């Protein structure tokens, strides 16, 4: 029946649902077919799927954080010691109910938690979340005098994107280079940050360059936040300030070549400490501190 | 009925608060006492080898002993001046060598197993259960933690390795020698020391009996040793409310240097060793100890040398004190590895409650 | 207290060295990519030194080059060289005879044996002979010896126990042991003849040899009328404790601090290690003595010498020497590990704990195992070595070879196999 | 070039070389001292005719000098400003023997354009000017020194191992009405025996002496007010060589904390080359301090080092006998005692 | 200004034998009157009291052991709005400086709503206790403010009834008297 093939099925259109929503209503899909009253034949087969799908991966990350979610989700679930039929169905429900959710958490993050750019608080913005963008298209219909600025994504141009989703709500904007990013933190007021997770020590797990960023936000004392939807709570850990679970190579030294073949493997990927985060915008309330390894602790109960 | 004043050496000016005197040598005490006690306080006292992990599983040990000795009196109940037994053991233990933060978890074991069969039972019953629980404890809290805690460690290397390490913990100890045998990986050890107490020197000899690559150092011979060097290990002794590391000495300075050095530092910890005593400095509370931890003169301990020191009390004006026990720096150390695996170090008191 | 002469007594110890010393001089030879000569002599001038003799005898016209070549050899020195030429091999016996005849003994004359580098202020050591002989006139010689590694086990060509004094310095027994290499004679003895007169019997046998030694006017003398004694520390020293000229007093130097000789291989190169480490005080090469030289000192205890060149990574374990002149290729795995002056790698090649002297070719993939390869000497392709193999003078290991442990190798162009000419032995080719 | 002329000429190179290599010679200042009469001895003998030529000797010499010992920088530096002060009497000399203008005291444009006398008496004071200055550097310090340091502040020292900071601080200690308490980190394969020394003196001079041990630093850093380093030679960036061990760290604290670190020297130990490597300069001591055994003690490859660098940037004034300077500064004092082409031989 | 804090300072004082000297900010617009009661205050008790210039605190800093706040209002990320003048800049000076920051709280005192900008949660001052005379109101601008807010960056502790906390962990402590419901009313 296949997770992986369900996946396929979303490319093209998608912005909308939660990515991590989709993976759980595909696993809850593949769930309900084989019989989830035994224990036996489910479980392990589920763990098993997990394994191949995380095998599988091309340079994806959130999908093993949602598993582990739908995991936990499940384990909390036969708790209640009455009998096998009710919470099998109740489970089978909860899959489309948590896809139902995102949307709701979506609506609640883009009306409540709005308040950080009002006076004309000028953005300096990169990672694209679907999050960020809403609550910024959402903040369009308010005209509280918004200002954006783009440091430029260059996995394959996703900057271009980026502008061309900007350009429907009609707000001047400016393109920013990342090397002249200790040249302009003076007119713009704060950093904020679309990411992939966030770690077990607190600091972001991100893309092309931020940990760059981090460090001029450090240094300017103007603060550094971080905005999603929340359940990226993986568990991981980076220890050092040079190692993740990574994709692609870790900075790969290339050979004495020839013509200008071997080079474009530029990290992708970058991350950086737990003492950045100013604030975190979550839809389970506006909670930061120590909120996600709290979290973390009440899910495994360490 | 005990012994008190005459103390070595002048008090100096500042510092001046916990207890850092005393029996060295035994003269004439009270007459019921039980001799274990007294012996691992002389130990403890004279100890050169101690480092937060083994201490509170040798008082434990002690413990269960005792209790296999103890005999129920033919008149009063089995706790009547066992309670004034303890109490006085206490008083000799933190005239020795103060109670750390697993010893006094330990206490409140003891007290909380106390309340719990309340005067009423015999002897060979109700002691052969207390015997066997406390050891299924000592097995639960203690061991298999610990082998979590290594497990937990393995994985956290990844490939190619160059190391910097220091202190005597025992759990480092364990670790450091499990990627030597059992992991065969490419684990280079450097060893960092220190002069109040030969951990260092221990680590290194450890090393030895299972034939590492072993560079050594200490304190201030470190601006060359980074001139490819990567990961950084230490060993705390306790957390306190507050997030802080307070543990002993040599740690924070090291810290720093790694910190400039651009590589992070990774510490461990127990799941039993959390505190609700809450300070932010060294001054408050504090391991201090007699002056003779600084007399020898380098190479080895056992060498007396007359050469150019060798006096205090005659020294007119001159204030010679060191520090054992430290408050390292917040935000300094990244990981740190207890009992739910992994996590940072702003969790505090995320376990105190939890109990 | 000064003016003070030099003898030392060279072309002594050859064959010890089984394989080598054969063509050429055996103090000749370069230790860490140049002559063990200038060691002791650089040594001696520390002491004090005011004329240089040395006893060559096994080639002498090649020494008589080298001597020439040399800086002590051009006016400014406070010591010029004259070696002495004799008849070819005579023991110590007959060299202190042909000494005497020349006659050119004075006071304190100092005579040291084999080749010695060590770190001890010498100037502390001559003011207590000094002392000790302005004590009684009968006072004779100087013995140095140092505190060991604790115990003693790479010990068996020389571990003598010495019974000593506390109160005076003065050994008491002389005995030589195979004990730790052949177990047949597990054995003690001490003799009475000094024992109701010292009181404090200290045991001993953790002491090193060293070999070098301040001796007054009676010396030669004594040599010249007991002509038993054709050796210096067995029959001589035993014959001192039995009082064969009676009531004489001698010494026993004792320093906390690290002194040794130069005897076999595996004791060479734990010499070898010793200096290059930080093990005696302030000897290096970094500093440059012989004037040619070009070395400077590196991190993690590596040697470069200007001209020295190695290639882009190669991961490296610990302590590693260059000599100038130098060619490394790429991808080689070294701890541990000197390769001498000129010398040029291929690639690929995985070499532990291991010597390499001058001009010497390890050839493309090749492993070298605490191993040793000798001037002019080359590794072709594919050479796998293990623990101590010896390789003597332009022996051309070619293609493709197999030796196992300790197999020695000869250097004349005998007795032992594996020869001069192409490929060492497994497929017989030679004279 | 070799000894090949300098034979029943001058004779006590040798000498020299000797005291460099076995370290026999003890202290930068009596390096100084040696190398200054040398020059003397130099000066006094060898015969001249020309003047060009002589220089280049001299480069040679002090090239040889070079290379028979690097980590002597005072050696040098003297040598340099001998050099120099014969330099500026030589330019006097060809303007006088031809027979100009300048913004300032020296030029960059004028190295672009085309540009028998008694220089020996000149040459020969130079030396005696060069022995005054190295004779008190201390009684032209405190008068910019008992002035940073005020009442119930507290003081950290570092490197008890040159001779002029020790003195330095007795001169503060001296005033009635001053008070300061003194924090003495130990510095331990290298510096011990001298630390303890020190603060065996501080204890005679009826002050508050403080003995700490290398690791407890960070259990007191809350209470510092002051860093000073004692330092054996200075360099062209601002930055300093210093007398061994137990610095560097320290300093680092220091510069974390914010805490104000000073440097006390001397122009004698003004140095006019740059501290490209650390590796080049700084030495190592001697493994065998540490530990006892050897057999297992090949196994044991400890790593020690005596001399110490540290970076221009923790360190902001070098108060000297001619006044408080700065690392952004010190550059022109240097040009200022030694000349343009005399910066390489 | 509470009379909380001057009790927690009198019982510290109470043990005399532990040594502690007083620097008091006299609080331009409307701390001044209340500064100076303080100071009274403290001389009542006998200690030792120094009277401080708002402008002169990096003058003071390096020489300032610990630091203690009285605060009105504390909240979510860690900060605290403070009973009026001279707390931001201190606080800066601080940072700086490296300096212990003590802070007496309450959890009533506590409020689980977040700050998010300066743009609102700052409470200005009155014009009235500055300058009198209004006709050179025409052409300046007088800017000043009573109650203000702190960064989180700063303070380090939060002596309570039940004990001292972390400004990046005190959210849990609200939350165990408070809800993520009872928010936004």
Not at chain 3, 32 to 37: G, Q
């Amino acid at each position: 029946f296949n997770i992986t093939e369900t996946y396929l099925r979303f490319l093209e259109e998608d912005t909308e649902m939660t990515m991590p929503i989709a993976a759980i209503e595909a696993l809850v899909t593949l769930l309900r077919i084989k019989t989830p009253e035994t224990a036996a034949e489910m479980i392990n087969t589920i763990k098993s799927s997990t394994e191949e799908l995380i095998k599988s991966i091309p340079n994806s990350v959130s999908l093993r954080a949602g598993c582990d979610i739908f995991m936990r989700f499940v384990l909390r679930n036969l708790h209640l010691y009455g009998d096998w039929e009710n919470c099998k169905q109740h489970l089978i429900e909860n899959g489309q109910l948590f896809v139902s959710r995102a949307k709701k958490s979506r609506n609640k993050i883009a009306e409540i938690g709005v308040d950080f750019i009002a006076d004309d608080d000028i953005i300096l913005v990169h990672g694209y979340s679907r999050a960020v963008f809403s609550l910024l298209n959402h903040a369009a219909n308010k005209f509280i005098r918004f200002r954006c600025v783009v440091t430029e994504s260059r996995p394959s141009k996703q900057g271009n994107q980026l502008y061309t989703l900007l350009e429907q709500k009609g707000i001047p904007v400016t393109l920013i280079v990342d090397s002249a990013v200790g040249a302009v933190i003076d007119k713009v007021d704060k950093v904020f940050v679309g990411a992939e997770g966030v770690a077990e020590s607190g600091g972001i797990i991100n893309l092309v360059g931020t940990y760059s960023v981090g460090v001029l936000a450090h240094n300017a004392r103007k603060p550094f936040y971080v905005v999603t939807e929340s359940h990226k709570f993986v568990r991981m850990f980076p220890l050092s300030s040079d190692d993740l679970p990574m994709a692609g190579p870790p900075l790969d030294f290339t050979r004495r070549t020839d013509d200008l073949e071997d080079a474009l493997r530029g990290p992708t990927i970058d991350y950086t400490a737990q003492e950045y985060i100013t604030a975190l915008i979550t839809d389970l309330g506006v909670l930061t501190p120590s909120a996600v390894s709290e979290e973390l602790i009440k899910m495994w109960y360490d | 009925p005990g012994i008190s004043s005459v103390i070595p050496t002048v008090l100096e000016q500042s510092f001046d608060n916990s207890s850092l005197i005393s029996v060295k040598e035994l003269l004439l005490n009270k007459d019921l006492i039980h001799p274990s006690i007294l012996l691992l306080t002389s130990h403890l006292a004279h100890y050169k080898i101690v480092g937060s992990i083994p201490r509170c599983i040798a008082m434990l040990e002690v413990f269960q002993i005792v209790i296999k000795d103890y005999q129920t009196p033919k008149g009063t109940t089995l706790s009547r001046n066992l309670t004034s037994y303890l109490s006085h053991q206490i008083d000799l233990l933190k005239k020795a060598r103060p109670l750390s933060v697993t010893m006094g978890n330990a206490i409140r074991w003891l007290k909380q197993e106390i309340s719990l069969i309340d005067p009423s039972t015999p002897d060979k019953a109700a002691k052969k259960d207390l015997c066997e629980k406390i050891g299924q404890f000592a097995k639960e809290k203690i061991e298999l933690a610990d082998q979590l805690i290594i497990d937990n460690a393995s994985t956290q290397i990844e490939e190619s390795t160059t190391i910097v390490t220091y202190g005597s913990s025992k759990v480092l100890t364990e670790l450091l020698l499990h990627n030597a045998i059992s992991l065969k990986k490419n684990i280079k050890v450097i060893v960092v020391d220190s002069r109040p107490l030969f951990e260092g020197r221990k680590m290194a000899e450890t090393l030895r009996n299972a034939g590492v690559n072993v560079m050594y150092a200490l304190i201030t011979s470190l601006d060359t040793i980074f001139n490819d060097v990567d990961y950084v290990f230490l060993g705390a002794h306790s957390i306190l409310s507050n997030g802080f590391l307070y543990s002993r000495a040599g740690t924070a300075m090291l810290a720093m240097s790694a910190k400039r050095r651009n590589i992070p530092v990774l510490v461990c910890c127990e799941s039993l060793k959390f505190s609700q005593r809450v300070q932010l400095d060294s001054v408050t509370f504090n391991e201090l100890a007699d002056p003779n931890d600084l007399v020898n003169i380098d190479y080895e301990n056992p060498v007396e040398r007359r050469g150019n020191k060798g006096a205090l009390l005659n020294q007119f004006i001159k204030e010679r004190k060191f520090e054992k026990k430290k408050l390292a720096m917040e935000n300094k150390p990244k990981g740190n590895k207890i009992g739910g695996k992994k996590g940072s170090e702003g969790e505090s008191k995320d376990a105190s409650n939890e109990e | 207290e000064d003016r003070l002469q030099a003898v030392v007594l060279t072309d002594s110890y050859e064959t010890r060295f089984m394989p080598l010393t054969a063509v050429k001089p055996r103090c000749l030879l370069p230790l860490a990519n140049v002559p063990l000569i200038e060691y002791t002599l650089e040594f001696l001038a520390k002491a004090g030194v005011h004329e240089v003799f040395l006893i060559c005898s096994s080639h002498a016209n090649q020494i008589n080059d080298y001597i020439e070549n040399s800086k002590w050899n051009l006016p400014w020195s406070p010591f010029k060289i004259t070696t002495i030429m004799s008849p070819e091999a005579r023991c110590t016996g007959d060299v202190m005879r042909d000494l005497d005849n020349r006659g050119i003994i004075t006071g304190d004359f100092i005579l040291v044996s084999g080749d010695v580098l060590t770190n001890i202020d010498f100037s502390k050591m001559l003011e207590f002979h000094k002392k000790m002989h302005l004590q009684d006139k009968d006072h004779i010689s100087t013995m140095c010896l140092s505190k060991a590694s604790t115990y003693p086990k790479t010990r068996t060509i020389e571990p003598a126990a010495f019974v000593l004094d506390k109160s005076t310095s003065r050994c008491i027994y002389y005995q030589d042991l195979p004990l730790p290499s052949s177990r047949e004679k597990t054995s003690i003895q001490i003799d009475p003849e000094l024992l109701d007169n010292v009181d404090e019997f200290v045991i001993r046998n953790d002491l090193i040899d060293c070999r070098i030694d301040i001796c007054t006017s009676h010396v030669p003398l004594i040599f010249q009328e007991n002509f038993d004694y054709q050796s210096l520390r067995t029959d001589f020293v035993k014959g001192v404790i039995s009082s064969d000229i009676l009531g004489k007093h001698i010494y026993a130097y004792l320093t906390d601090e690290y002194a040794v000789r130069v005897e076999s291989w595996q004791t060479y190169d734990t010499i070898s290690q010793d200096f290059l480490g930080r093990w005696c005080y302030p000897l290096v090469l970094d500093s440059n003595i012989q004037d040619d030289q070009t070395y400077s000192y590196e991190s993690r205890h590596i040697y470069k010498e200007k001209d020295v060149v190695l290639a882009q990574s190669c991961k490296i374990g610990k302590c590693t020497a260059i000599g100038s002149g130098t060619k490394i290729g790429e991808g080689t795995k070294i701890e541990n590990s000197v390769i001498g002056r000129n010398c040029q790698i291929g690639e690929n090649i995985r070499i532990k704990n291991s010597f390499i002297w001058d001009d010497c070719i390890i050839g493309n993939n090749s492993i070298i195992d605490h191993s040793l390869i000798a001037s002019n000497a080359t590794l072709g392709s594919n050479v796998r070595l293990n623990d101590g193999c010896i390789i003597g003078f332009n022996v051309k290991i070619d293609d493709n070879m197999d030796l196992d442990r300790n197999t020695k190798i000869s250097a004349s162009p005998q007795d032992l196999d594996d020869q001069t000419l192409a490929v060492s032995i497994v497929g017989d080719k030679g004279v | 070039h070799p000894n090949a002329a300098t034979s029943d000429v001058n004779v006590t190179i040798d000498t020299f070389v000797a005291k460099l290599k076995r370290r026999q010679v003890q202290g930068s200042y009596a390096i100084a001292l040696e190398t200054l009469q040398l020059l003397m001895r130099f000066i006094s003998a060898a015969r001249w005719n020309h003047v060009n030529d002589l220089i280049e000797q001299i480069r040679d010499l002090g090239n040889s000098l070079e290379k028979a010992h690097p980590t002597a920088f005072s050696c040098g530096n003297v040598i340099r400003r001998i050099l120099a002060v014969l330099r500026d009497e030589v330019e006097e000399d060809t303007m006088s023997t031809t027979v100009v203008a300048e913004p300032l005291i020296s030029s960059m444009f004028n190295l672009l354009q085309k540009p028998k006398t008694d220089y020996r008496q000149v040459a020969i004071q130079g030396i005696k000017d060069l022995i005054d200055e190295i004779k008190n550097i201390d009684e032209g310090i405190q008068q910019i020194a008992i002035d940073l340091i005020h009442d119930h502040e507290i003081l950290l020292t570092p490197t008890p191992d040159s001779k002029t900071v020790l003195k330095f601080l007795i001169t503060a200690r001296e005033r009635s009405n001053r008070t300061f308490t003194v924090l003495v980190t130990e510095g331990f394969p290298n510096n011990t025996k001298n630390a303890h020394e020190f603060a065996k003196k501080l204890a005679q001079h009826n002050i508050e002496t403080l003995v700490v041990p290398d690791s407890a630093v960070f259990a007191l850093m809350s209470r510092v007010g002051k860093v000073i380093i004692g330092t054996k030679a200075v360099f062209v960036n601002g930055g300093t060589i210093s007398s061994n061990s137990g610095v560097s760290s320290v300093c680092e604290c220091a510069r974390e904390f914010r805490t104000p670190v000073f440097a006390v020297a001397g122009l004698y130990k003004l140095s006019p080359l740059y501290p490209f490597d650390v590796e080049k300069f700084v030495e190592f001591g001697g493994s065998q301090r540490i530990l006892p055994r050897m057999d297992p003690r090949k196994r044991l490859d400890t790593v020690n080092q005596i001399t110490d660098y540290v970076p221009p940037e923790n360190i902001d004034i070098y108060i000297t006998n001619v006044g408080g300077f700065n690392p952004s500064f010190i550059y022109r004092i240097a040009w200022d005692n030694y000349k343009q082409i005399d910066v390489h031989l």
